[PDB]
């Protein structure tokens, strides 16, 4: 708990030594604890966090998108991420891809469209904190409306790039005239207007009312949205702060990726932990925390993040998120599974034989009686 | 003619010696559509370019992943049998999936409970044999010829376990006792494996069939794809056979595309799995679609293997004088296509304008109902 | 006395120092049958020929990917515990399905809701610890020992995920939050991890039951595998627990297969996936059939690992005078096997003979029954 | 004060909580370059974002390929030692180059041949040690700071093979037979590894000399860069070791490039491989030219790592007021690089023009003579 | 140093337990240090033994193969073995394939062929303690001479096959008849009699004096010789052994090989050390043995070998071999590489400040005093 000087030092008691080269003071100031780790660090662990502001951001009329994907985090093969930004009535270009897309809106709203496998058409507005989630291959767009959207992407697989979606009007780009011609019934002179190259984030005025929008078909209605209102739910509600989930068994759609918001009051922090499923990919909204990750054989390592950052913990690898700021610690856990789980160590430990609980920990009833087999998510300290 | 690869004020002559009727069968790839823009693997490959395995009785031939590299998924073989011939009782780790295109054979084949299924297929029916389980394929009077498709793209025709295999590898005492019989009476078991042989034709299937206390299979592994009712649509037809009807396919869904002269299988993509395809008949052109500026266009005649990878989009179109017949393979449980067309056709017309930089003289040909094969006006 | 690697007037006599044990017991392999051709993999390996973790109150041996590696997906851990020993609550990856060979144990799990399950096991019970649920075993009054297999073949018994180990790489500040506790509280909190320790024996049962709000689990994690009825042919006795049976055993399914002096594991072959063995009792022999020609005969003996391929033709034929006992495992969620002699027997009889060269005197003898273990 | 990415019509500003200070330091990420198109892997890391290994007398912290996976041939680690303290003797499979930014320290090494080689090492001053060679470092009265680069990007520092803990895990009788000595002569031999301990300053390098009877080592593992002569050009200076003037670095070829502000390290590339960079000081911006219309712009600043892949275009230009410095490196066995300028400067000047739709005004400018940093 | 009952229990002090399950007895007192390892073993380190007698055995007229690939032994990616014994007058067919082979002469001796890049033929013949290397693609034979033949090939890649490699009769069975008569300007009928299939191992007369089967041709003679006599060597002896080097520089056209022979006598062992160029690959012709692998980072496992036996070292890991039985301990080290590079523990120590390994080792003048600047492979025990 001791403090750092101004100029932080990597100095831990009698471990460490002042820096003596040129330094990158700003980023040590946001590295607490890997400038100093915990003295109970140990070992090689890879890398498990990055910044979106370490990022090119690929500016466009209309908006911008950045990215974090496994050229950026390696550790992280299976899901990838795009930060985008849409200004009012900006439209992200109808396209698909062979990804799952989820979706979480920070701020602002957009209106969203999607077809399915049988020809069916959902559209439908979002807000913030609201997802979306699109299976493998079904093209879609996003329009932002009034107050524009910026919204984060996660896609289930780590090799994705934002420059390599299926655009629309790339496709037709690179069809030749006489077969989009065929393909509609029309003539070559009817379509020589088409774009000769992708639009992928334009401006555009502001749609209309959603009802005005709405395309009913001969295949009707699609069976489950393609939207959920992740904070209208009643959140899971703890000492320390709340916990939104969603997955596929209450946002049906949502197949491949399961997903939580967590918010975590100063002093409290999301509690001791796993996954018994799938690796966790994090995404810091706003505060400040540290996550040890516990990788088994005598290895832990700790690592800080802050508004903008990723995160990752690999499969079963124990872990935790402590507020180390003074404002609310706001973050996204996000799994490629169709559900979420997690063991709570607390609650483990609190359904079993106190003395078995003792015999390992070497410690007495005073500490088996504090356990509880309710599981508290985020926990308040004292 | 002596075509060249020139194409407006692009390209040259050709100043080398070459392959002239190669150059004919593949007019869009010695002159490309102005549309095609970079790297983009190859697509096609022709049986005529494989090595023909000849035996007495019939012949196999391969397309595989040694061949054609981006079909790392699926496999096929060209498999031609006289007139009662024999492909020997054997198994295979993948899971095979057949279409009849000349005459009629009898399959067998014994599941994990000891059931058999025995059953005659003749010209546009399936098969499908569930990975691991042992079968066999016996032309009836007019022989047989046929495409198999396998679920993996390392198969080699050359490597499947054969019956009379297993027992020449296997200690005659072991054999003898498996059976209850003495090493003499197993002395004349073969030394090494058949894998296709002439026999005398097979009598009734009727009388065929074999009887047995653990009862009938299930679910058929035979499926009548030509007497399905197909979709129809202005340029052709399509029959559709994926593990929602025909119910054993799990690992493989099919179609029988038909596509009249002048008609084009429309512009669409896969959002399940990659698309194998063979050309049955016909002449055709695709352009594959890759993504990031990237298309590229090949040509497909009688005897050509296709592919296009998972979420392409593509197109079929007929170049020829005579109707175009290809397979569309996927090695998944289910067929699944989005049409750009109908896709377009169910968002609100001005969003569709704001993309394309046209009117409504366009918006309004869009159709919500799908076509998956047109005819040009 | 001297076995040489002779086979009629193939081979030769052996000239250069030699290890004439191993030889004796792979007689199979020093003399293979004229039959086997070709290049096929390793099939076999000894858990003699490990490094044992010895520990206080009992040890551990394991048998991966790095030893046997044409075992990709499965690996094993043979586990020794004394008299009220502890394997430490941990947890890992992989999935675990175990075999109770000696003794009897406690076991402990709980889910992911939060729900606990304890109960016995003795000989010839089962286990099966889903992937990532944390768990512990206890010896009771007469020790146990057992044999592990986890669901990866990249396994290893040093890293799995243990209680202290992760108590003692989080900074004490972190604990203390998350109990709300202060640091002086937990300044006895080991350094280390015990992974094996030795403890007294535990109560009964009863005792130590923990009800919970979340309730009871809906399936249970052991199942009494040699309480079932098994498969009884003319030359042993089979029994196998897979998902169907054993609910919780979801991607292991699992075979109890004993055979008399003079029987055999007929000729069969798996259209579901590999197949990994552990010879509990016996010896035996088998021929991999691995297509194309390539056949390869191996030697097995109690404490022996092996393994077949997916699809590969094989048998399990016993070579000794005392029962041959050994374990199949699957990776997946149902045991299923195709039988040679079934096979046959539903086929056209005249179709067979066209195939063997054989006639009527042959096909008669087919049957249409499988019988998995036949008798000479 | 507050930057945005915006970039004429395009862009917005940024509605989400984000991280202002980073933005600061990367303006050519958060507002690229027009020119810049397509996906290029990220090439900038920083030390910053590493975990610090903390020990008594120093730190170590690294960036490996699981920090920056471009970077799979080469990996460092940036280490720090107090006066006196010591980085414990030790080998690992990689070679291992250094340059020594602040202080001074003491190295040991001895071949394969027996051999020893000592000496001391100033501020820009380098050392190789070849794959394999056991070596220590000592710092000297003021400390040292200096950064180490590894021929593998999958290198640890936690991974290299350690005297003590080597002694550690080797049964006590066989090390008592190895040195003719009894197990209670070494029961004081530690039972872990130091890595990194405090100790007393050294005597003079006169005093630390050992002679033997294999001679002196051939080559010195040491090599004073900044004593040699630079290739100084209008913008700044360049000082190469590689194996033609150090002879000893074989699988390492190293530059030192000093940029005056207002100047840069001009447009380039290299024809033999992939360029792992570190910036010492000051703020620099560089496009890495992927081929195909991709392009991508990064920045660095002090304590940042780069990458340039083999082939691609780059230059490295001075953003900021005070000199830029940075280390080149290479594993190969010579520099190499092709320039811009040169190679259009050599050619007939009315073929440039047909390529460039420039004229002879611009042709005229072109210089037969390499600089490698050009001043505004 | 305690010893075990006639049947060991894996029991160390208090650490370990009995046996409570059916065994092989036989095969734990082959490994004693792995029922019973050292305390000072920890962590996980693959399998470095394999056992020729656990492998299937070829037989064929004439003598015997047997292999120890990668297949067996996976650390030994890229070198792989196989035991080859000949009869009186066998031959090995005229052969060739993509690996190096290097060769060690156990029993008996043999004539060897081979044909280089410039159609120029080496033949000669090796008895016991010789050496040939045959370069990758080089066609090659062996024919045992009257006492027979027992010999070890190492081959430059784990991934081969003894049934893989290229025979001249394989060959010409796979020819059409027509082109092989075009080839040589001869008939079909002339060349009805090839085999039909490989002979691989065959039976044969011996064959006459050397100086009678020497061929001479237009391209001259070969410039460095295929086989060397390693046992007329000088040895480098130590007080408890010898050890015999041949790698490039001395042997020289074995230039992916390296390789040497070292005998130990009872009470002797081959001291710690470690090679700083390549992973080293062991066959165990004699005796019995124990090495421990000391893997880095705490990790370190001993393993047990005799007679028969292959083991593997990792590049860099230290290690000895210590003689733990009554007779000589005989056994080959190979290294894929032009040269043989070893550094002894002693001798680097030797060769530093004895104030400065007194600091590391927390011991004092009386061992930095034993310390010898020459290096001596096998030591003997006091
Ligand atoms: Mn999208
Ligand atoms: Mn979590
Ligand atoms: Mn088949
Ligand atoms: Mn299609
Ligand atoms: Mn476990
Ligand atoms: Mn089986
Ligand atoms: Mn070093
Ligand atoms: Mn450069
Ligand atoms: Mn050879
Ligand atoms: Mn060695």
Same mark, same amino acid.
Not at 69 to 79: A, M
Not at 126 to 135: Q, S
């Given at each position: 708990?001791? @403090? ?46 990055? /910044? ?23 550790? /992280? ?56 989630? %699109?299976? /493998?291959?079904?093209?879609? /767009? ?8 910026? %919204?984060?992407?996660?896609?289930? &697989?780590?090799? !994705? ?22 393909? !509609?019934?029309?003539?070559? *002179? ?6 000769? +190259? ?9 749609? #209309? ?11 009707? *209605?699609?069976?489950?949205? %393609? ?12 000492? #320390? ?9 209450? !946002?049906?759609?949502? @197949? ?40 088994? &054989? ?57 003395? %078995? ?9 005073? !500490? ?11 926990? +308040?300290?004292?």
């Amino acid at each position: 708990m001791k @403090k750092q000087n101004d100029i932080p030092q990597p100095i831990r008691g009698d471990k460490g030594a002042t820096v003596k080269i040129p330094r990158n003071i700003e980023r040590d100031r946001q590295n607490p604890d890997m400038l100093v780790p915990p003295e109970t660090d140990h070992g090689t662990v890879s890398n498990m966090k990055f /910044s979106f502001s370490d990022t090119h951001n690929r500016l466009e009329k209309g908006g911008y998108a950045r990215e974090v994907t496994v050229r950026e985090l390696p550790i /992280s093969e299976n899901l990838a991420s795009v930060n985008m930004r849409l200004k009012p009535g900006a439209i992200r270009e109808l396209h698909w891809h062979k990804e799952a897309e989820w979706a979480y809106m920070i701020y602002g709203s957009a209106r969203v469209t999607i077809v399915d496998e049988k020809g069916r058409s959902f559209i439908d507005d979002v807000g913030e904190g609201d997802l979306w989630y %699109f299976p /493998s291959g079904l093209p879609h /767009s996003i329009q932002a409306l009034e107050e524009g959207a910026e %919204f984060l992407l996660v896609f289930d &697989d780590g090799s !994705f790039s934002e420059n390599s979606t299926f655009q629309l009007t790339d496709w037709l780009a690179h069809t030749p005239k006489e077969v989009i011609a065929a393909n !509609f019934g029309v003539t070559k *002179e009817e379509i020589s207007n088409l774009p000769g +190259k992708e639009k992928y984030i334009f401006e555009n005025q502001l749609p #209309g009312s959603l009802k005005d929008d709405i395309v009913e078909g001969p295949n009707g *209605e699609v069976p489950y949205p %393609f939207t959920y209102r992740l904070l209208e739910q009643e959140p899971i509600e703890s000492e #320390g702060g709340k916990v939104y989930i969603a997955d596929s068994t209450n !946002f049906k759609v949502s @197949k491949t990726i399961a997903s939580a918001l967590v918010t975590v009051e100063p002093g409290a922090m999301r509690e001791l932990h796993w996954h018994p499923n799938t690796h966790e990919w994090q995404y810091y909204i706003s505060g400040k925390a540290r996550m040890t990750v516990f990788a088994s &054989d005598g290895h832990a390592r700790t690592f800080n993040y802050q508004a903008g950052d990723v995160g990752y913990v690999p499969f079963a690898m124990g872990h935790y998120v402590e507020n180390i700021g003074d404002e609310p610690l706001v973050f996204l856990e996000i799994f490629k599974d169709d559900h979420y789980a997690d063991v709570s160590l607390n609650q483990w430990l609190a359904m079993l034989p106190e003395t %078995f609980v003792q015999a390992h920990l070497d410690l007495g009833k005073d !500490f088996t009686d504090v356990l509880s087999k309710e599981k508290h998510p985020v926990v +308040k300290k004292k």
